[PDB]
Design a binder for this molecule. Structure first.
Ligand code: ACP
Ligand code: CA
Ligand code: CA
Ligand code: CA
Ligand code: K
Length: 994
């Protein structure tokens, strides 16, 4: 460990005793592993704690019941409500339903965490180091990195350990340090010592902290600290979780839960304002104080009833349940609420290279110049065999094997490929295959040089490791590479400044080797390499070249082309400024065209099928890439974005064509175009911006850093598992499988969550409206009170509890993917659904009021009150003045109240079965499709029986029930609500709107 940034780069190398150009030795790693251990963290991976995870109570709807539980305990502390023990029970039926949902919520989330960590553990984090094993570079498991060895980082990488920067190989080096210092914008680094030992992490501008990403550039450094000695390691538990998330679904639910909290506020204020006239009845006893307080209780007890306290839990359950299902499809949900958003997505933007395609590349076609005779131009087209990164294959011309060394243009094409290249070939001795190091594109050139072998290097008797970079090491032995002009997405090309390695002649040898996008390089080509000679770039030549390039990119091979050129007379080293890269394009002028290579890059096997499925789900797909349009168009046709013969005149644009359009037609283009090529990281970020300006939910799929702005901007970023860390950090979901078909299943799961969330709402609204209607109806018609504040708080515990939450386990509808996606501007509750809520709640209230009233009449055991509703309270005690009041006092009886109660419990259990699907009949979506619901109902019902028959309990809640004759009655009344809602489903089942 070196806790020093105040020390210079030489002082840091001296600290561990390492050479910058060799690295650590096997013995040195053995010893440093004993001393410093592995590079990893032991425990508590975003695990929270046992009791502090259940402290998620801090939701508004839940908070209300908490305060309600206190004032229900405060009034109880006075022993009020004309009762002793049941007063202390009131706050506990409230706590129980909260404890219930809080447990299920926590229970589900812990499973999501345990599914995620099992998947991240299936693919180890990696890092690149230089050790004395090889002259070359080797990347290892991030855990096998020790304080001392020389580590290499680059664009899109995640910094594996706390590293003192040694050499910044690029013009600039920017780092995303948001995870540690909060610095949003990318941060520049350097290599000079920071003498202050006490300097804060923000000022350590010569350090690379672990867990952070490289925004731009390439750098070499030395590891100071690993494992827990890492800066981010010291703050593992402290600041465990910090994120930003406010999804559209969450926003709608917050707006819903807010205004819904306002109606219940008024109703319960109304409830208290209405029955302020029964303030003095001989039951409560004329005590005005104990009159308004009782109805303050029923108002609060009704609030608790009406309020969906399970809403924060059912949201939590569905999301965590969704995160787990996606984890089974090898997807990593980096944000629970984001699963819901991918359900109501209308358009999906996608990167091409490495996202829609496999990014497994290989040069299979290439041409140079044959002859230029006036208006006549001819090329030497070549075919190369071998599609893997292996150096076994042959160069062909008209299907005949050819020594590449004979053609001089091929010697130069092989030279530009070898030098103007930052990648290499490693032969994995444990996998037994040739793997790439760096970009797949540049690597495709590396293997080409090997297959060409223009200098005929003996390779028949080499090892499989030596064979990897033989023909390339020959060219590097020949040419000393002075420095590299970076690849810039503005000029879309790069170059190396090279002189003869042996330095045989200073005057004779000096070249700049350029490769990049054809149209750019060729436009800057003033000469054309014919053989070993040189001729001026003319119209016909440029036409003939670009014609064959078009022949390849549009062809059924779908080729990826790079033009190769050499600036014959480059500027002097001191005539060039390497600080900025904006000057680099002019350095790549006066070029001499050498040749063009064409790459193979097959679309992923399941892309075409996935795209076609989205088209059936009302979802549009837009390809966005920095590659050629002609090539990009022919891919869209092959994967189902365009037809084989679609007219794409105004549905495919380039970066220049797009920008040439007014901001009006720039925005309009995004509504019809499905292919944008030759674009920028900003373009990708703006195409999403334009799509979002149409009130559409947008998803972005990428793998590179050029996607990061677009990935962050979209409602859902989706990065490939084989993609970059920057892309993954920018996205909310990661396809670790690289399976594009998962995006399809993530949409189906996303819509299924929205539906179950609706069924939760429809249930708790339609049912609880009945709870409101019940109290409002008995009062309006001058009937005895149906419910007691404790009875209101019991039905709430049992009907708003688990049967509510179990709705989050509903199987999705059968036609869930055949319907168009839901508009973002849709009301959470439609105009028609609000009618269903009332129709059910209307009957429910009526059904449960007629319950208590029936006891007063047609019940044989109950005393009769004749016909035409003779219910008035004048009798009371000593009915001296009355109308046919043979009975002394029928009021304040426990029996009629339990009748109204048991109906509610049964009738609200009933439409929970109706809440299995929005429109599907119970004949196609039976009760046993959601077993968790049946369990809740069984429990909830059996929990009702226990209260009625275990005798220390019916004293607490005023009730006494007949064993059979009453249960038969409440069933006759409850079951029709299943019938009623069934009618309403059939109504929308035959009339399809929505
Ligand atoms: N390493 C390299 N050296 C020189 N030129 C390169 C290069 N890599 C890419 N290019 C050229 O730059 C152009 C744009 O690169 P860019 O990264 O912006 O788009 P891209 O197609 O390579 C990634 P994607 O297709 O996933 O959007 C490419 O079309 C290619 O012709
Ligand atoms: Ca409730
Ligand atoms: Ca890419
Ligand atoms: Ca209810
Ligand atoms: K995003």
């Amino acid at each position: 460990m070196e806790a020093a940034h105040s020390k210079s780069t030489e002082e840091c190398l001296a600290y561990f005793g390492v050479s910058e150009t060799t690295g650590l030795t096997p013995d040195q790693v053995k010893r440093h592993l004993e001393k410093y251990g592995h590079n990893e963290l032991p425990a508590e991976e975003g695990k929270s704690l046992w009791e502090l995870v259940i402290e998620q109570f801090e939701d508004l709807l839940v908070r209300i019941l908490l305060l309600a539980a206190c004032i229900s305990f405060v009034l109880a502390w006075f022993e009020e409500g004309e009762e002793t023990i049941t007063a202390f029970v009131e706050p506990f039926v409230i706590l129980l339903i909260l404890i219930a949902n809080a447990i299920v919520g926590v229970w589900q989330e812990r499973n999501a965490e345990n599914a995620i960590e099992a998947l991240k553990e299936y693919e180890p984090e990696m890092g690149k180091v230089y050790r004395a094993d090889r002259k070359s570079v080797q990347r290892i498991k991030a855990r096998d990195i020790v304080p001392g060895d020389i580590v290499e980082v680059a664009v899109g990488d995640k910094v594996p350990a706390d590293i003192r920067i040694l050499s910044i190989k690029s013009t600039t080096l920017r780092v995303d340090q948001s995870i540690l210092t909060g610095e949003s914008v990318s941060v520049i680094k350097h290599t000079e010592p920071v003498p202050d030992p006490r300097a804060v992490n923000q000022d350590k501008k010569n350090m690379l902290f672990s867990g952070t990403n490289i925004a731009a550039g390439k750098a070499l450094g030395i590891v100071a600290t690993t494992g827990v000695s890492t800066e981010i390691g010291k703050i593992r538990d402290q600041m465990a979780a910090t994120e930003q998330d406010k999804t559209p679904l969450q926003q709608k639910l917050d707006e819903f839960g807010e205004q819904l909290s306002k109606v219940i506020s008024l109703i319960c204020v109304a409830v208290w304002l209405i029955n302020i006239g029964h303030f003095n009845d001989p039951v409560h006893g004329g005590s005005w104080i104990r009159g308004a307080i009782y109805y303050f209780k029923i108002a609060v007890a009704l609030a608790v009833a009406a309020i969906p306290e399970g809403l924060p839990a059912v949201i939590t359950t569905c999301l965590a349940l969704g995160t787990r299902r996606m984890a089974k499809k090898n997807a990593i949900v980096r944000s629970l609420p984001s699963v819901a958003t991918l359900g109501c997505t209308s358009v999906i933007c996608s990167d091409k290279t490495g996202t829609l395609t496999t990014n497994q590349m290989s040069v299979c076609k290439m041409f140079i110049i044959d002859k230029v005779d006036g208006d006549f131009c001819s090329l030497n087209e070549f075919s190369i065999t071998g599609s893997t990164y292996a150096p076994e294959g042959e160069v062909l011309k008209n299907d005949k094997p050819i020594r590449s060394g004979q053609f001089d243009g091929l010697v130069e094409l092989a030279t530009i490929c070898a030098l103007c290249n930052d990648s290499s070939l490693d032969f994995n001795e444990t996998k037994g295959v040739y793997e790439k190091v760096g970009e797949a594109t540049e690597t495709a050139l590396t293997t080409l040089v090997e297959k060409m072998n223009v200098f005929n290097t003996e390779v028949r008797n080499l090892s499989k490791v030596e064979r990897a970079n033989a023909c390339n090491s020959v060219i590097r032995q020949l040419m000393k590479k002075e420095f590299t002009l970076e690849f810039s997405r503005d000029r879309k090309s790069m170059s190396v400044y090279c002189s003869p390695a042996k330095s045989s002649r200073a005057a004779v040898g000096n070249k700049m080797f350029v490769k990049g996008a054809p149209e750019g390089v060729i436009d800057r080509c003033n000469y054309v390499r014919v053989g070993t000679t040189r001729v001026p770039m003319t119209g016909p030549v440029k036409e003939k070249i670009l014609s064959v390039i078009k022949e390849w990119g549009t062809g059924r091979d779908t080729l990826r082309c790079l033009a190769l050129a050499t600036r014959d007379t480059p500027p002097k080293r001191e005539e060039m400024v390497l600080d900025d890269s904006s000057r680099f394009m002019e350095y790549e002028t006066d070029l001499t065209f050498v040749g063009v290579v064409g790459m193979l890059d097959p679309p992923r096997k399941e892309v075409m099928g996935s795209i076609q499925l989205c088209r059936d789900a009302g979802i549009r797909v837009i390809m966005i890439t920095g590659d050629n349009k002609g090539t990009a168009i022919a891919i869209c046709r092959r994967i189902g974005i365009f037809g084989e013969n679609e007219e794409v005149a105004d549905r495919a644009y380039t970066g220049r064509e797009f920008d040439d359009l007014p901001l009006a037609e720039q925005r309009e283009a995004c509504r019809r175009a499905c292919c944008f090529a030759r674009v920028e990281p900003s373009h990708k970020s703006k195409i999403v911006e334009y799509l979002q300006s149409y009130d559409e939910i947008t998803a972005m799929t990428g793998d590179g850093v050029n996607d990061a702005p677009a990935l962050k901007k979209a409602e859902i970023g989706i990065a490939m598992g084989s993609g970059t860390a920057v892309a993954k950090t920018a996205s909310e979901m990661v396809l670790a499988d690289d399976n594009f078909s998962t995006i399809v299943a993530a949409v189906e799961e996303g819509r299924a969550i929205y539906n179950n969330m609706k069924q939760f709402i429809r249930y708790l609204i339609s049912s609880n409206v009945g709870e409101v209607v019940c109290i409002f109806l008995t009062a309006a018609l001058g009937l005895p009170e149906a419910l007691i504040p404790v009875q209101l708080l019991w039905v709430n515990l049992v009907t708003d509890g688990l049967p509510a939450t179990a709705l989050g386990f509903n199987p999705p509808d059968l036609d869930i993917m055949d319907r168009p996606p839901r508009s973002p501007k849709e009301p959470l509750i439609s105009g028609w659904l609000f009618f269903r809520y009332m129709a059910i709640g209307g009957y429910v209230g009526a059904a449960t009021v007629g319950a208590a009233a029936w006891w007063f009449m047609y019940a044989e055991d109950g005393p009769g009150v004749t016909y035409h509703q003779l219910t008035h309270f004048m009798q009371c005690t000593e009915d001296h003045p009355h109308f046919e009041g043979l009975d002394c006092e029928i009021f304040e009886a426990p029996e009629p109240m339990t009748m109204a109660l048991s109906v509610l419990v049964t009738i609200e259990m009933c439409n929970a079965l109706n809440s299995l699907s929005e429109n599907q009949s119970l004949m196609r979506m039976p009760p046993w499709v959601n077993i968790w619901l049946l369990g809740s109902i069984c429990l909830s019902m059996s929990l009702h029986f226990l209260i009625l028959y275990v005798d220390p309990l019916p004293m607490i809640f005023k009730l006494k029930a007949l064993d059979l004759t009453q249960w038969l009655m409440v069933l006759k009344i409850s079951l029709p609500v299943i019938g009623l809602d069934e009618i309403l489903k059939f109504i929308a089942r035959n009339y399809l709107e929505g």
